[PDB]
Design a protein around this ligand. Structure first.
Ligand SMILES: [Zn+2]
Length: 140
């Protein structure tokens, strides 16, 4: 589990979105596994605006933050998980690391702020849903 709180936005994995998230929906995209809902309270997370490929992510299944190199946000074939079939997922970045379903929502951060959240796992890779192209999170 986990979310990003930026401005009056809450960013979660689409597959973990709550009724309240859907009842306050701003934007959602199944192909990215992202959903954004509106918040009453100001969030303080800063979204990275950069093309970093090194950062640190939180892995709830190990109670650890791991430094990782990660790939460029891309359209990748993801094998079936407990929450999605085998499919193509867009705006996805991979690293070598541990990721189990419960780890979805863990933050990947770089020197510029939050890069994205854990979205995929398996076969020794961790996949992150990028948010750095969502420039509107910074405004409105
Ligand atoms: Zn960065």
């Amino acid at each position: 589990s986990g979310a990003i709180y930026v401005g009056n936005y809450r960013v979660v994995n689409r597959h973990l979105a709550t009724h309240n998230d859907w009842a306050n929906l701003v934007w959602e995209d199944s192909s990215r596994d992202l959903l954004v809902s509106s918040t009453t309270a100001q969030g303080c997370d800063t979204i990275a605006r950069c093309d970093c490929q090194t950062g640190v992510y939180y892995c709830s299944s190990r109670r650890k933050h791991y430094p990782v190199s990660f790939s460029k946000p891309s359209l990748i074939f993801v094998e079936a998980s407990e929450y999605y079939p085998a499919r193509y997922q867009s705006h996805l970045m991979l690293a070598v690391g541990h990721s189990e379903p419960g780890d979805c929502g863990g933050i990947l951060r770089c020197q510029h702020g939050v890069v994205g959240i854990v979205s995929t796992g398996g076969n020794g890779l961790v996949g992150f849903a990028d948010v750095r192209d969502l420039l509107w999170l910074d405004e409105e």
